[PDB]
Symmetry: D2
Subunit: 430 residues, 4 copies
Amino acid sequence: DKLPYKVADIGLAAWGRKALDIAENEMPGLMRMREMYSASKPLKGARIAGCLHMTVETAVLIETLVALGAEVRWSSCNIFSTQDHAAAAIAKAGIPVFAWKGETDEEYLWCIEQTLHFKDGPLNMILDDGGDLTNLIHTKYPQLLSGIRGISEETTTGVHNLYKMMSNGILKVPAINVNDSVTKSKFDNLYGCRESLIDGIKRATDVMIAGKVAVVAGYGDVGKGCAQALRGFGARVIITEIDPINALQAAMEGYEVTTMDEACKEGNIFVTTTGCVDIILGRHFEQMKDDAIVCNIGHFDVEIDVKWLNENAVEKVNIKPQVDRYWLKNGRRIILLAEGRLVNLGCAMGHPSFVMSNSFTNQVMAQIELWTHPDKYPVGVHFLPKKLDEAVAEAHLGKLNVKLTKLTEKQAQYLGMPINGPFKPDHYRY
Amino acid sequence: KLPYKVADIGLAAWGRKALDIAENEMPGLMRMREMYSASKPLKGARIAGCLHMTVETAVLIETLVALGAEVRWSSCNIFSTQDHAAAAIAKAGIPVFAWKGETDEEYLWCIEQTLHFKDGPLNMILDDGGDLTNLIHTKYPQLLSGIRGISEETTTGVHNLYKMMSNGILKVPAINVNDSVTKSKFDNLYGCRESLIDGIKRATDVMIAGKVAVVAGYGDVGKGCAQALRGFGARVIITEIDPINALQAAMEGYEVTTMDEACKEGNIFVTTTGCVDIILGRHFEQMKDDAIVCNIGHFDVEIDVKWLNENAVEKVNIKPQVDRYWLKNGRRIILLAEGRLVNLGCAMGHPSFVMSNSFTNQVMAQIELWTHPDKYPVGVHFLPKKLDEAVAEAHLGKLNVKLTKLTEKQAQYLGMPINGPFKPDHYRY
Amino acid sequence: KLPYKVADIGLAAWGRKALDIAENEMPGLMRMREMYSASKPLKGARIAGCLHMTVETAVLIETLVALGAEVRWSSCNIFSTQDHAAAAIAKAGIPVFAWKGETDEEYLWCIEQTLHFKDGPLNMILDDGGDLTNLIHTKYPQLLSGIRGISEETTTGVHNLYKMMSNGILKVPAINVNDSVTKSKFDNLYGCRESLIDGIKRATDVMIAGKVAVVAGYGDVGKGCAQALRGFGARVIITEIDPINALQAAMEGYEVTTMDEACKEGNIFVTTTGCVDIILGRHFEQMKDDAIVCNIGHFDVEIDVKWLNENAVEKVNIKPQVDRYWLKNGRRIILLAEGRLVNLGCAMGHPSFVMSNSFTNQVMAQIELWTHPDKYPVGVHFLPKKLDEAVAEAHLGKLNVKLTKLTEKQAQYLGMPINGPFKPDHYRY
Amino acid sequence: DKLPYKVADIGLAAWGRKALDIAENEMPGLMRMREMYSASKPLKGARIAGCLHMTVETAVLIETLVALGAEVRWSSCNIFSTQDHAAAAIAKAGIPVFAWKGETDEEYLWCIEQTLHFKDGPLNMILDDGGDLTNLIHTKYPQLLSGIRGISEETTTGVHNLYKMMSNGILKVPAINVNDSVTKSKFDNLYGCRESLIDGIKRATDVMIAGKVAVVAGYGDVGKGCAQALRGFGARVIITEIDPINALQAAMEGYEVTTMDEACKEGNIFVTTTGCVDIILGRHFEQMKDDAIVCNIGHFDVEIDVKWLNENAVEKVNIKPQVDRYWLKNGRRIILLAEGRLVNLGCAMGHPSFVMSNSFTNQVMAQIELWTHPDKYPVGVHFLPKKLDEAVAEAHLGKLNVKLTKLTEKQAQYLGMPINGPFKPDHYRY
Ligand SMILES: NC(=O)c1ccc[n+]([C@@H]2O[C@H](COP(=O)([O-])OP(=O)(O)OC[C@H]3O[C@@H](n4cnc5c(N)ncnc54)[C@H](O)[C@@H]3O)[C@@H](O)[C@H]2O)c1
Ligand SMILES: NC(=O)c1ccc[n+]([C@@H]2O[C@H](COP(=O)([O-])OP(=O)(O)OC[C@H]3O[C@@H](n4cnc5c(N)ncnc54)[C@H](O)[C@@H]3O)[C@@H](O)[C@H]2O)c1
Ligand SMILES: NC(=O)c1ccc[n+]([C@@H]2O[C@H](COP(=O)([O-])OP(=O)(O)OC[C@H]3O[C@@H](n4cnc5c(N)ncnc54)[C@H](O)[C@@H]3O)[C@@H](O)[C@H]2O)c1
Ligand SMILES: NC(=O)c1ccc[n+]([C@@H]2O[C@H](COP(=O)([O-])OP(=O)(O)OC[C@H]3O[C@@H](n4cnc5c(N)ncnc54)[C@H](O)[C@@H]3O)[C@@H](O)[C@H]2O)c1
Ligand SMILES: NC(=O)c1ncn([C@@H]2O[C@H](CO)[C@@H](O)[C@H]2O)n1
Ligand SMILES: NC(=O)c1ncn([C@@H]2O[C@H](CO)[C@@H](O)[C@H]2O)n1
Ligand SMILES: NC(=O)c1ncn([C@@H]2O[C@H](CO)[C@@H](O)[C@H]2O)n1
Ligand SMILES: NC(=O)c1ncn([C@@H]2O[C@H](CO)[C@@H](O)[C@H]2O)n1
């Protein structure tokens, strides 16, 4: 007596399928997983609850998991990130999906709850992005924990939470940290944001980047890509940081590194990338240039104090969906994107398919590892082996017409490594 | 007769909000309003405009009206109208005939609606690409003697004016706005550096990083396009006919080769030449699977779209202005905006700040021609450097740029007028 | 009289090896030799040259001689001579009066040695910065009627020629070589992009990454300098008097402010203005400890070196052309090349490939003035675009650039001559 | 009856001292070690044999070790890298140093042998760059191993050798891998090469970079910096790689990735960064463009087959020290820099002082850790703790006028980290 799916408009499915066809041809990693494993069906018996942005890219991931034998039920991990034509295509394919663009907070929680119960029993695998599904099970459904073989987690904030859960004795299910595969963190977080930040800002505002001062809070993988994107279009980028190593990197790349207390007086565009609370506050907003654009690409909605704007502005003018222009008591305006929620996914289409093929090939590999080799994965947080990490990269080289060199026997002996790798030590930072 | 013709007048409120935001990004145009709204230098002008009907152009239109002109408007491209901007203009009582997705015949009908005002025929032309200019000269020559001047926005349009003049067929004075320094070195370069990728992304959501991109032409537009693609991690290959532009591209680290070679390597193709026959059937047949092909230069003639329509074995419309073709060789080609300007057809054109440079020049040109016509005999003219410098200066405050002033000692040393102009007429910036 | 005067003729063999390497990087000059060595268009010319006596200039000198000229040479800067290049020229029998580290009086003596040949006084000038031009006009006016033409290398020199002409005091026709497209947009820009950092590094070995660098001026030289510093991870701040150049710098992501503000922040200061009084005592007094200060523009007047010498409390010579001053405030300033051109004074100037563009223009200018003087009345002239394009084309093969040729259909469409020139005279590239 | 030092010309000492004074003011990390530890003298009793490029930067390191109480004896680890004025200043200061620019291979070995015996006994600490000192002791002087408390090793190839020695049971002394401190590998190897490669090429050849094709073999930290430097000056850079992850990084940065077998036909400049043998061979040289410039910035002299040039060229013309122009049987010329040895140190001045202050502050810290806390360091290869790594970066922020943000108590609680760090997990790649 439960809904089979819930999406904005299943009639968008034909357009969705065209977008999926294009994406498949950009995602050789996922297509190789299908070629290699569609017959052997390694995920047979798996019942995967997924909580991850319901985008065209994610649809390709979902169909890969199903091709490999899994049953899947899906929700988005963000109220604005669903692409309704992708959700429609997945629903039309008979896969239970509960996701649409513009969910309320109540609807969001309800959608996750729809993914827990399958025909043959409760979920036995978690594929998570940000840990909401992980946390829901541990907090509200502890009786389901014993039946879950593994968790794979997509993003930096999610994995931070898993390590904290483990250190405090709260984690009860083995997890693979997908974020920190080399082929995820050094590609998705960096090159993905380098394209999708600007895409979000532009679709929302059509603002010129050239000539502006842009303030980027944080200089981790996300901040590095955001800063590079903005600099490339001729913004002058100012960085804030708490970590002296990341701060020194930023200075050595030619960026001014200062505090938000100083930078708020100069920025025309503000991007938060920190995964931390209380980055942009009332005292900052009051000092900003007129029509400063403020957005978050890090986590949830707490980097920016959106509550302060709602409480203190004279008026909030909605410009269009996910774009609000606040008029402050000082007579100046602030343009806030996506209510302070992820701007690339909320105001544009998130990362492009090619780089998401890296991240999602790691996801499929992690699901196969946890489902088929559980003995290798005790309760705790684990990485994929370097050999598989390398294999993700190798699967994407052909599409780019990259010609990789093979070591000669003489060179392999000289270096003391195998011809087929792995080629780097475990601590290598790339 | 119709007061206007637009897609949906109900879009006017949203249009107005977008115009409000754009005004705050366009200090040059707002300064023209501050300076000239009382004195109304364009009183008596009846300006027919043919220029992409975007949010940015709406700000220009309302500036012309604030300065006392009567205006009637059409777009210069069948896909470039932003319907909310058109609706806001219509709602404000200004005759505009423009919508996204015109037929070719509707396009001409729209230009024709701009020619006659209550008080008489048009007496000024504001053009982008020469269609209004050519229409009057070829079909309505009886209207020419009543037109005081033409201002022309874009490289292809000004090329046509110079050709008309050399052939003795130009009959109205024109100002070349494209070749103001503050237009050509800003709009054509930095505008395309942002809006090319915006068009490609909204249309395809393709990853740029890791791709080979082939840019045909390395003029102002090609320079901006190449820099954009390289910034996102594409490997950019350039084609050129001019050895100077070619050497520039080589000295910036780009491979410069022919399209006959580059067609085998590119994943993304962008034409920027203003020339016919850049991408042909023999090129399409060699392209990598799902190569994305688009034009940012002129009209629809850089890419042989006719060839694709006639020779593909499948053609699937993905969404408006995005078509995916399957060739006999089994490979696919993705064509944007039917080969028409991709930045305006698949996205929103250049952002407002840089359009404020171009459009401040347009307002200055209209004022010069309308109020000082004897300074402009039949022929093609530039705005004075002093005015060109003034356009730039008007945008410095928004960016918090602090300009240095020469001391009297330094001005004497340089033999330079202390308030400019600061460069000789041949200076290339 | 002396056959030459150089530091050490024993350096000639090493000089010749360096010239051999440079010739293979200078296809424009080598092409001039291939085309004109038999016909000897410069037969009868007696060229006095005043231009940095470097390896690159040695290739130019031997090209002029190959084309039939007699030549006598001096450097235009007291620190820019490369002694091995000077020795190779001297060994080849060419009168050259140049060494690194001349006194100001020796500098003038060297120019004076170039004026008289066996067959009579000079009849052509090849100048860089106007010193030879000014010397003749002011001290040897009786020689003017015997001089057929002047070609001038650099922005400051051509500025002086235009001033002379407007004041009615220029008495010999001149060609402005600086403002060939293939000179100004290449040498001034890409040359400085490499040779500024070479000068700073050889002098100081300072890390660029992490520093704030202040570049005064954003013309061709300032653009090249700023890009170089940014590429290595310096944060670059720009000063400018021209609102157009200022807006360019802002649109490229640089902070544009005054020297009065920037002096408090910079670790490296580079002057590129061609103007007096850019860095003054009030600036030095505010600078970060061990700020490195240098000039790449003109003469020694951009930086107030007199102020440092008079006001520092300590001055220590680190090595040739590097001085470290201690100010009364206890902080240190490092001054390069006594405020003279840092790229030529502390390193080797621009690399040979880009100098081949500049120097091919110089050879073309000398040929034009010597063989077609009636085309050049007294005044300041440009080389024709056709020749400018030819300079670029002559360098494409070395870089393996493949230039596209228009089809006859395309040339008709564009109304363009199929072999060029391809751009109108106002084109800015 | 042994020499007290051996240098090119001790009369260069006054110029050397001026260069050292300038460098000190660029090296706040080393100067902070002096401020903090010159009175307590933590290295008292240490007798450190050092084998590391005898440059101005290294002189500042040497004087720091002596200020901290160590006795030191020094040699260079490269026959061309010594800066004779720096060596003179160290000799004049009474420190035994055996180093000059342009040593023969025999003289090189002799110089290392001079650093082993002190007045009060044999060395009891090793500071090494490339492992020659480490290998000499293990192979020729095993009886000295028991008296050595620790090894600190500077460079990637050196540390590779230490791990191999450990895996084969040959390492008998505890070692700290300095190369893989974050503040070394991500700064020295990357930003150092980004400046010093071009400096070497320019001083040797004065070649224009703009317009050229440059081929960079390897895209690790060194290759990344070299490629960026060359691209910045307008070369078109082609990368070769054996590792699919590094290769994908290069492609995503806009470089063509192909094999040397293809790239040798196109390159005008060749830079080897691999640490591997047999990168540029006869079959490559024969296909190169006329006057191709060929150089190595990786390891020793075996990346480039210099022996092939010597055996097969028609003639070798010496242009000036460390620059040779070979005329081949095909009539074309090859310009080889520094006989295939490190081009940045051999043809220029190596990395600038500021970034060497990061590397050498790690060296001082490693010497203090091994000398004063030996119980923490069993036989094996170890990293410096992240807290010290962060402290190296923090010590350089003031010179750059960087303003680092401090977490609030609320933020530190939210993130679950200490206000004073460390701020990243052990696996973080920066
Ligand atoms: N929107 C997306 O598509 C996307 C993609 C990847 C990751 N993410 C999210 O982005 C965020 C950042 O991810 P990351 O991988 O870059 O993590 P990271 O740990 O590499 O970088 C975060 C940086 O923020 C800095 N920081 C923390 N608090 C700060 C403060 N108060 N002020 C200034 N700097 C501060 C840290 O020192 C760190 O260097 C995470 O929330 C992650 O889940 C989003
Ligand atoms: N979409 C836009 O927003 C936008 C903006 C500005 C200009 N434009 C248009 O873009 C086009 C280019 O303008 P521009 O200012 O760069 O002009 P330009 O003259 O500076 O550059 C065009 C270049 O194309 C080269 N070229 C010509 N034919 C060629 C061919 N067959 N193959 C390779 N190269 C060839 C020329 O040598 C020239 O360097 C024009 O049509 C102009 O109207 C469009
Ligand atoms: N060292 C070299 O190898 C080399 C090479 C080429 C040119 N030059 C010399 O470099 C200088 C600059 O040449 P260019 O071609 O760039 O000329 P330019 O005219 O293009 O640029 C100089 C810029 O300085 C700006 N300026 C003038 N006075 C200023 C001041 N007080 N403060 C800030 N900005 C100011 C001007 O607005 C102008 O934009 C000239 O002296 C020229 O002869 C040297
Ligand atoms: N000259 C200097 O100042 C300097 C500075 C730092 C490091 N180094 C040295 O530079 C070298 C590289 O150091 P790194 O830190 O970049 O190491 P790295 O391991 O990060 O990079 C080396 C790269 O070379 C690649 N490689 C190996 N064999 C190859 C082959 N046959 N063809 C193509 N690519 C190949 C590897 O895949 C790797 O990515 C080492 O020898 C190191 O000791 C020199
Ligand atoms: N197009 C997409 O589906 C997309 N774009 C970005 N992300 C993921 O969103 C996560 C943040 O929630 C990041 O870790 C990315 O991997 N997914
Ligand atoms: N946003 C806009 O209205 C816009 N964007 C680009 N262009 C103009 O379109 C012309 C090409 O028709 C160029 O010359 C630009 O000036 N207009
Ligand atoms: N290597 C060289 O001989 C060299 N380098 C730079 N310049 C010239 O020096 C002039 C400044 O005097 C500039 O216009 C350059 O053309 N010459
Ligand atoms: N200026 C210098 O002393 C210098 N420059 C580079 N390197 C070191 O040289 C090692 C290679 O032998 C690298 O790991 C660098 O840390 N030292």
